[PDB]
Design a protein around this ligand. Structure first.
Ligand SMILES: Cc1ncoc1-c1cccc(Nc2nccc(N(CCCO)c3cccc4[nH]ncc34)n2)c1
Length: 266
């Protein structure tokens, strides 16, 4: 738990309510991003989600995952993260349309390294989308938003949800939609959608379609087309991520290899 007296918040709300702040550490100040909830008139489920996020993010340690500073219980309830100051990747690419192919590949490779770590750690993210990739710099991406994430049971490779909730269905794999089963391979499917977004400079996927129409499209074997100017090898990797059968879809170790820009062995 953090000391309210060591936190300064700027008033501007970004996009729970979000503010930038400065948190005084043992020697230096750290720039932070804070999600803020009201103490009494809050939504208990939304607070439960951020407590769940905190519980997950306390167990993670990787350079491509946003680091939590802590929780502050004061005039409001606050979840404090190290700030990735350039913000969400989708918004960044919408506003910066001359980011080069090599640079987009570098960023999505960093996401694949964070996700290879998550997969090794046996956590499922369950909301992997370009809006949840935050940029530290134009050459350094981090994964964020662990509100739906789950620690997998020791005896299974998937989390089974009771039924469909309110979900980011356009990023979800068919086994998620049809059987409510979430594995790291389901996150790989989402990563393919994230790649499409990144090479479409933050356009929304399955534009104009209802979730039910996306399900029917995918079951027929149809997929989003290649973004204008997208490197062919990156569109081919998207299609591999969008393998319908979860058993033939690659895991993140295989995907991460395919985003490296140097020679390697498997
Ligand atoms: C555009 C926008 N909308 C909401 O936040 C932003 C924004 C804008 C610029 C920078 C950042 N950076 C950032 N860096 C780390 C965490 C963080 N947030 C705010 C939500 C970002 O989608 C968080 C605070 C508390 C818990 C969190 N989990 N995942 C992110 C996050 N934001 C954001």
């Amino acid at each position: 738990y953090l000391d309210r007296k060591l936190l300064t918040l700027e008033d501007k709300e970004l996009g729970g309510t979000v503010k930038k702040g400065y948190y005084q550490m043992k020697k230096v100040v750290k720039t932070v991003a804070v999600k803020i909830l009201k103490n009494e008139a809050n939504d208990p489920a939304l607070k439960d989600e951020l407590l769940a996020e905190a519980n997950v993010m306390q167990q993670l340690d990787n350079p491509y995952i946003v680091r939590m500073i802590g929780i502050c219980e004061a005039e409001s309830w606050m979840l404090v993260m190290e700030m990735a100051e350039l913000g969400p990747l989708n918004k960044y690419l919408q506003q910066n349309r001359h980011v080069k192919d090599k640079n987009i590949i570098e960023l999505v490779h960093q996401v694949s390294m964070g996700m290879k770590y998550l997969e090794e750690s046996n956590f499922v993210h369950r909301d992997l989308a370009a809006r949840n990739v935050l940029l530290v710099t134009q050459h350094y991406a981090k994964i964020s938003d662990f509100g739906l994430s789950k620690a997998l049971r020791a005896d299974e490779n998937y989390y089974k949800a009771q039924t469909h909730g309110k979900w980011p269905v356009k990023w979800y794999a068919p086994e998620c939609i049809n059987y409510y089963k979430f594995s790291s391979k389901s996150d790989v499917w989402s990563f393919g959608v994230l790649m499409w977004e990144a090479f479409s400079y933050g356009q929304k996927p399955y534009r104009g379609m209802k979730g039910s129409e996306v399900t029917a499209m995918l079951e027929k074997g149809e997929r989003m087309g290649c973004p204008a100017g997208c490197p062919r090898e990156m569109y081919d990797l998207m299609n591999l991520c969008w393998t319908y059968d979860v058993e033939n879809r690659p895991g993140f170790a295989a995907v991460e290899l395919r985003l490296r820009n140097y020679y390697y062995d498997v």
